[model samples]
Structure formats: structure tokens, C-alpha cells
Target chain A: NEFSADHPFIYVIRHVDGKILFVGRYSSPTTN
Target chain B: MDIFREIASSMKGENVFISPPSISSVLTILYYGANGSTAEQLSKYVEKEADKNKDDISFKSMNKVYGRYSAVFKDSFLRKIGDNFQTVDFTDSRTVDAINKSVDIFTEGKINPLLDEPLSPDTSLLAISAVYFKAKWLMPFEKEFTSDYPFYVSPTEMVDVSMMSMYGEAFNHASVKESFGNFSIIELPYVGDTSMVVILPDNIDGLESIEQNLTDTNFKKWSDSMDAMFIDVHIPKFKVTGSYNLVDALVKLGLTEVFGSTGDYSNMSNSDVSVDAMIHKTYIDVNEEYTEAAAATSAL
Candidate 1:
């Protein structure tokens, strides 16, 4: 829930077994 | 036994080590001095300590009473409760000194400053219970195996603790994994009849369910399910000290008539005398050589 930041955000997801499998960070992706 | 569960439930997510025997003792003494419905309410908590009182090799548990001259206490009550019920004038300047010094000497200084300040002269009675126990482990954990190990305070937070380990024929062990949570119970024997029992929740956050199921029936069932087996065990070496007023705990346990103003105490005195506070403090040290525990409780 904390990852949803249009002003540049970060997210980390871990499995039930304490294994972190995903990491993502980006700003609002919009272009002309 | 219910007191343990009641208190444990009240103290969720915290390390708790309390002596129900110590807390219940002083209150039961107050029960005897009560009359009418107040006594009726208190009559429930009396008795059943006889079996736990069975002789232990080196544990000392005793209680003493200090009363005021105005209370008109009975002769039988005085003699029955340790017979050392030293009558003290509560209004005197030496009241706190006398009580604190007596308590210090009684527990061999393990528990002092029980009363750092003076009490009210209007106080009719004060009963104190002290328990001191120290015993070597029947199978001591190897001091060589003790080391600073990582203890999970939670994810992203780890602290080093001196974890003590033993690998061999250990005491009876069992795992109770029900809807609540998977947990392990290990009974570690001391030198005497007493043994330290530790229950660990399989999940660090699963303590809530285990505590909810911590009733008398479930406790005995779990204890009876233990079986002796060769296993490896690692227990943390730690010391914890706790001080509790017990007014909240007692209310949660549904024993509150004595603490109320309307509570009748005709037997204790000619006039009304109610309990103001039930203060209890407990300490325990767990290590390789032995485990030492002591509790000091007061009812005024």
C-alpha cells in the first residue's frame, strides 16, 4: 500500500518463506 | 492456574513472569478477615495450595502480617499466620523503616525496598508474602555452548542474545499444533520438585492464540502429552524483573469485593477496613548453573 506514490515510489514483495522476489521503483509513467 | 492465564492475556505481546502463589497468598489472608458477601466472594480463591506446598529441597516461602493496634485482630488469626504478626503502630515515624527492614531481613536482601515510603495510620492490616527459590539444573546446559546468537525481534530487527544450548537426552517434550498455532513445550527440571517450563510459538506473532487457549484444561492436557526423547534444545539466558500493582489483574480475575469501600470486614475489625492496594514484585534469573526466582507481595 505504501508503494503507490505517483511522486516516485518503491515496492518490495517477499514470499511467505521470507524470500524477497520483487523490487520496483519508478515515477509517474506518462509521456506525449 | 486461571490467574496465570488471566494475567498472561492481560499482558499481551510482552515478556511476563509472575508468581500467582505469592499474589494469591496475601489476598487469601485478607479473605479470612472478611465477612458477609465480601467473604463469599473471596471464599473462591482459597485452598488448593496444599499440594504445591509439598516439600521441595531448597525453596523458602513464608508470609508475615503487620497490623495496627486499632484493628482488634483475633488471637487465633495472629498465631495461625506465622505467629510473628508483629503489631506495629502504623502512624509512627518508624513504620516504613520497620516494615522495610523486616522484609529485607526476611528475604535475605534478595527483595528489599518493598515499601520505600510510609503507609497511612488509618491502615488496619498489612500482609506480606515472600518466596525465594534457586536450584541447579538436573542436566545443566553446557556453559561452553553459550554464545551470542541472533534473536529475531521481528523482520528487519535482530538483536544478539546469549543463547544456551543442550543436545542429548532432554526432558519430556511435545508439540501442540492446533487451529490456534503450532507450539513446542519443553519441561526443564531443576534440582527440586520445581521445573521451568517454556512454551514457544512456532510463529513469533502466534502468541495470541496460544495465550487464548491457555486454560486449566489445555495446560494439563499439554503437560500430560509430554514424552521423553533425545533432542537438542537452545534456551536464552536472561533475567527479568517485574513490578505490578495487581489491582487491575485482580479485577480482571473477578475478585474485587475486598478492594471496594462497601466491602464488609466485620471480622477484621469493629469498624470498616478495606484494602487499598495489592502490590507485587517478581524476579527470575535463568542461566546454565541454576535458576533463581523470588517474589515479594503486599496487601495493605
Candidate 2:
């Protein structure tokens, strides 16, 4: 219910050793 | 959330930080899909595809930080990709310097505050994360007849500060409590998607009080008593950066046992993994220079 019933799109990256990670930019803050 | 907690320890270091993930969640919706179901589906699909890649392959990994959203990245992705995007040389510079560079680039230069120096890299592990936000105020500031005067920084120590004099209507305002005193929250919306929220205390030293009494309940109570007021608002283009040993803060916040020498995060890989430490580095820039902060943790 928090993010609407529509399954939220999410991307996850795991490093080879699963240490370093980077999440991408979402435009919501800039858009509205 | 679970994923962040799983590997949260390894993400700590001197002058390194991580975001709360809420920003990332908003990002997921905008970048991936509008519909929640579609967003989740897309994230899972992309992650699965990444699992398919073999060989000594270098790929860009993007993960969802909040809501129903996914981080779209590259797997040999494309031309203008954010790969190895090192804004600062991590090897030569101090951890603080490297972190400042990372935050500047991460926020696209919106935030440029840097934390105090003498940062020690001898923590457990360190990492940096940032979010750039730009938005317009609901009631934009009219560049009218502004003036400068000696502002009362404290009860005595006064300094000349430029005041954005607005004779328009009263905007959003609120009264609140802090650990040491009472305060107010005033919002200034930008033309874009962001607004600057200022928390002013009744006393000059009230900042310490408010910060010490930080909590969700206290914040809610403060917002409940807010009101719009008409006055000349003079706020300096400010920057704030916070560095905290996340492990210590978490334990202090009552989320202990997870990072103890004997802990449990087996659900991540079904392996006996104990958390070591937690580090968080944060930077906030308003209109001037940026400030950077970091946190690091280590397990026994």
C-alpha cells in the first residue's frame, strides 16, 4: 500500500564480491 | 530494505556515507515505471538478466532504493553511461576529499558541503552515497526589495546577513520542540521540485536542543503545530554535512545485535554472516559551497 498496489519497479546490482553498489537516478524529485 | 540491511556493514568508511533509500525509491518510480507492479517486475527482470552475464565482465549495477522502483543501468549498457564515474581520485586524496568529490558529482553540484577533516580511513569499510534534489517552492520567492542587516545569530553574537525580504502572503510555518528548547519550521519552495525547510529555534543555541531530541514522533508533533506567518525571511545559503559511525548510532538507536560479533543475516545468502560495522557519510549543500560527511563501522 505504501507504493501503490502496482508493483514498483526496482533495480539491484550486486558486485562480484557483493561489496560496492550504486543505485540509479529517479526523476521524481525533479519532476514533482 | 532487506537488501540494504544485509550488506549495510560493508558500506562504511571514513568520510563515506549512504542515503536512507527513500530517495532511491522515488527515483525507481520515475526512471523505471509509473505502476508499482510494473516497477517491481522490471527490477526483478533486470536483476535476473544481470545474473545471466558471465566471463570477466564489467557491468553497471543499479538497485532500487525505495517504493516500487528500479535503477536502470548498463550491462555493457551504452554510450554516456555513468561507469567508473570517479569525480575524485580515491587513491591520492584523503577520504574526506574523495567523499567531497563523490558528493559533488552525485548531486550534480547542487550540494557541495564538506565535513570536517582529519578523517580516519582505519574503520571497517567505507562507502559513499548521495542524492541530488532540485525543486521549486510551492510559493516561489519574488526577488523584490531585499535588504541586509545585522542578524541576531545568538543572544549577543550578531553578524550582518542578507535577508530575502518578502511582503507576499504567509507561507507554511510550524512550531516545534527540541531537546533543549522550542523551534519553528519554515518552508521555502523553489520553482522546481524541491523546497528548503528551515528549522529555527527560539534560542540561538536551540539547534543543539532540537538535534538532540530528534525523533519521528517529535517531528510529527512539531509539524502539527505549524502555521503560516508573514515576515522578512533572511536565510543564508547554507550547507550541512553529517558524519556518524552508523554502527554506534544504530546500536544507540536500539537496532543492536545485528552488527554484534555474533549476529544473523543468513537470509541474504543462507550463509552464516555476522554484521561488522556501519558507516554513513552525508553531504548537504544549499546555495553556496558543499559540505561532506562520512561514517564507518567494524565488527569484533
Candidate 3:
């Protein structure tokens, strides 16, 4: 699973009710 | 509907005092809060939260740890809206090379001096990036007509740019004036009734003035009180791109909770799991030839 993905990260903002406020996309150069 | 804008609007009105500095300051503030925490903490927290909500992605300790601190604040909020969104990022050296090269290629080498200057060692410094690129041809123009046209750059420098020429019938137009300048607002309506506001300063010299008067309240007025017109307009097809560091920038703006040795971080502190730092990176490009000019503030 290392090379299949260079290294992609996702971050989310969630509420106590389990509802997601937002989701973000991230790519690191070291990983790629 | 980006998450940065979402959390931002949810906070203070862009930049509360200076309307002009709001755009950059807004992101800087959020970056301060998110990036101050360690990347390891940010990654695990983001992953646990995102996956808990059923996001189709994974998080890594190396990524979560080192990546988050690499930049001040970076990432985008994605939501499926009738199925028309697709994006992928390969965090590899080749991918980075491709991205760096592509920016040079697309901008035609205009932005060569990027990420070059003394970049405060990506180690102990907080790094966050946000980039958005929008290209469209709602009305196409011949490449010949766009050769060597005078383009306006804010503060200084009037460079000759290749501009798109079009006289499309039936364009959404607006007639409005801000407190400081005459703004001819143009709306580029996206697929889902979403839009971006393209405010072209009439004075050519009113660039900074226009930015200073851009407030949520006045923006609301502009939205509510706009008149559509049918006239031939010469919209210089241009692209806008900008990047900034969040650490010092955010501190300069105000939000000072997650820095220095002693700080309050109740969000990720209870017994053991300690929040480290948040890292982010983003790239965005928008031009007139392909899309309309628009900006928005959504409510959660």
C-alpha cells in the first residue's frame, strides 16, 4: 500500500452528533 | 464551500478590522490554530474524525506527524453534490516535481520565484497551503486576439498579458459601487447554483481600495442590490495565484491560543493523546477565459 499511494492525507471536522462539518485534502512532498 | 472559508465565516468576519487584509488573514488565523498542534496529532485527529464520518481515505503516522507541520494550514473540505467532483494527490517526489513543473508551464513561467526564498526550514516552522485553480470557456476567444494586452497588477507594474476576447450574449452582469471604488460585478454560476463573484475595479487604480471595502455586510448589499446589464464589456482574461505562511501571519492578525511553551489545547488533550502540530498545503488557479468571476460565503 506504500507505492499504490505516494501519501495522501485527509482531515475532517466533526460534531458531537457524528455529522461532518468539513473534509480536507492533503499531499506531502516527502511521501510523494 | 471550502472548509477554510466555512470555519472562517464561522469565526470573525474575514478580518474584522481591515477589510483589505481579511482574505489572507482569515486563512492565517485558522492556520495558527490548526498548525500549532503537532502534525502527528493533527493527522490522527483528522483521520479519526474523517473516517468516523465515513470518508474514503487513510492516514499515516509519518504523514500525520511530519506533513501537518510542513505547512501552516493546508487541505480542502469535500462533499458529494450530485456526483461531479474528482481529485487525487500523489504525495511523491515525482508528483511534487509534476506539480511544480505544471505550475511553471501553466503560468508560462510568470511565477518562477515561488517557494524559493529562505523557506524557514520546513522542520520547526508551521506550514500550511491552500490552492484553487478554475479554468473555463463559458465564452471562448481566439488566441491571436489575446496576444500582448495591457494587464493591471495591483500596487505596481502594468504588464502586457495574453488576454481572451469574447462578446458573449446573455451574460449575468451586475452594476454596483463600493464605498471606495466603482466595481462592475460579474457572476460565474457553478453547476449547483453556487457562484464566485468577480469584482473588476473600474478605476484600474482602485485595486487595493476595492479589496479594503470588501466586507460581509457590504458584500451582502452588493448581492441584494445588483442590476443586470446588456452591454459589450472587455474582461481581461487573467489568472490569480497567491501563497503565504501561517505562523507569523496568524500571530500578526490575532488568534494566539496554540503557540509558545504554555498553551491551552483542550480539543486534543484529556489524559494521554497530545496534540502536536497542524500542516497544510494548497494550490489554486482561476482565469476568465474558462469561468466566470465569483466568490461566496456559505452558512453552516
Candidate 4:
């Protein structure tokens, strides 16, 4: 795992039209 | 599959999480020591003992067994987990701390006081597994763009949360109506082959319905039907932890063969041995550390 401590997030995340980061957990976001 | 469902339905209407592979990995130790029908039933869960590096993810799976000082374990199974195995007097006051310390070191402090409550004094063996996962997003989010937005707890209940939003982005998503109802499934990509699949039900209160159709057949169909479309994606930033009493869950999956001394123990030790309890803990954090793509300089 060549983890980059430089950033809190992961990957070659650049910006482009209609380019959505496609990863997330599927719970109804909450703690309670 | 049944075991996962066992955990999910048990914690309905609540935020739930589990380190899929780590829990199974720890059970592998139990599997090795198991015999006859006890081992046979457990085999269903650990059938496949099975990751990427260039994806910028750090994953370490650890398995540990804490047994009584006077415990006599089989030499055969002992050699299998030689590096991580230990024997401690379950009756000693420090036993809980020792187990917690090992868990702390293994998870790199992501979890602490994992065993806050003391174990049963007559406990013979404590088998545990910890998974440490660290990874970044393929497309990092721009911090300036995040804002508080309404998150629908139900069709009528709306709550404000720190929403990380992506606009003018093309995502792989599809809308379909199953017997249960209609929902949208989106494929979110990480840097590698791994991706997060989010299935958002049209009805804010439709989670229970969606959970029913969570089968392998449906997942495969949804993934194949997904088409790329330009849309706005919004997710709340959150960190959550979940704990499970696996002993209670596993039995529901017809794994009762290993719970009592009548089954098999010729593999673990000379005396009659049967599992009494099992526990698992999991943690995850998601935030605005992601985005799509644009031309950028490579410093490497």
C-alpha cells in the first residue's frame, strides 16, 4: 500500500465534466 | 450470506458495519481446531480465504487466540497459527487488558478497549480477528464545495448534515423497479478494481424493502445494467463503528454443531472443547476527499 500521507483521501482524483468519485458505504448516513 | 443477513436484520433501522473478511479470517482458526460436524458446519463460512497495493490501500488482517494458561491445545492447530497465538489465565485480572493491548496494537489504535467487559472466569479460549484498512479516494473532493444539506431520515423526517456534493459528474447509475420497489444503484470507483456500490431507494423509508432484495442475482443484474449519466452525487461525511456478538449470529446460520462439547474437539485438545462466545468490531470513515478527473501534474 503506497499510501500518500500528503492527502487525507485516496487516488488520481482530478476534475472533469460528469466525473463522479464512485465509492461509498451504503448505510443511511447516521450514528444514532 | 445467511450470517451477514443475521447481523443486518438483527440491527435493523440502525447504522451497521462489519469488516467482512476479518471476521471470517478469525473463524478460520476455529475451523482448523474444529472436528467432525463442528468443523463441517463452519466450513460454509470460510470456504474462500481471500486484495490490491497500487490502489493506495493499507490492509492488514490479524488473527489472535487467547487461551487459559492451563489450556492444552492440539499441536497440529498450534503450528498453523504459531506466530499470533498466546495462552493466558482467563481468571487473572490482567487478562482483559492483555487481550485489549494485543487488539490495540493489531488495529494500530483504530479500536481500543475492545474487551471492556471481563471474560467468563472459566473461559477456555478467546479467538479474535482484527482488520486494519486505510485507503484514499480515486477522486478527492474539493473542501470548499461541501455544505450542510438536508438528509432524509424517512419520507417525512429530514435532518441537516455536512453533505459532500459532486456536480457535473458522469456516474454509472441505473433506476429499476423490483418486486419490492424502485431504487437507483450507482457504481463508485476507487483507484483500483475495487468500487463502492450505493443503492439508493426512491422511497426514503424503503430500506426494509430494499434489504429483502439484496441477493447475488439482483446485484449482478444491477451492475450489468448500470449506464453512465451526468448527475449530482451527494453523500454525508461520517465515521461509524459497529460491534457484533457473533456467537448469537452464527448459531442462527445453523452453526450449532460447534457450540457444545458433544460435537468434536479431537483437533483442538485431548479434552472436550466447544466454542462458547465470539465478538467482532468494525469502523469506517467517509468524507469529502474525492472528485472526478482533470489534467494534473505528476510529481512522482
Candidate with top DockQ is: 4
Q: Across residues B50-131, which tens digit of lDDT does each residue of candidate 4 receive?
A: 2111112344555667666786888998887666678888788887887778667766676766775676777667776665
**DockQ sort, best first:** 4, 2, 3, 1
Q: Write the per-residue lDDT of candidate 3 for residues B142-196, one digit (tens) a residue.
A: 5555545554443254445444444434445665665676756554433332344
- Superposition error at A16 for model 1 (Å): 40
Which residue segments of model 3 deviate by more than 4 Å?
A: A1-32, B1-135, B141-144, B154-157, B190-194, B239-241, B270-282, B286-300
lDDT of 2 by residue, B215-285 (tens): 43554455456566764455443333444455544444344444543343222212232334444344433
Task: Choose 1 or 4, whichever is better by TM-score.
Answer: 1
* Better candidate by TM-score, 2 or 4: 4
Supply the TM-score for candidate 2: 0.47
Off by over 4 Å in 1: A1-32, B48-55, B79-82
lDDT of 3 at B270: 30
Chain A (alone) TM-scores for all candidate structures: 0.47, 0.24, 0.44, 0.18
- The TM-score ranking, best first, is 1, 4, 2, 3
Count the clashes in each prediction. Answer: 0, 52, 44, 22
What fraction of the true interface does each of the listed models get right, in terms of native contacts kept? 0.00, 0.00, 0.00, 0.04
Model 1 Cα displacement at B38 (Å)? Answer: 1.2
**Residue B92, model 1: Cα distance from true site in angstroms:** 2.2
Candidate 2 interface RMS = 16.7
Say which candidate scores most in lDDT: 1
* Residue B289 accuracy (lDDT) in model 2: 21
TM-score head-to-head 1 vs 2, winner = 1
Q: lDDT score, residue B154, model 3?
A: 33
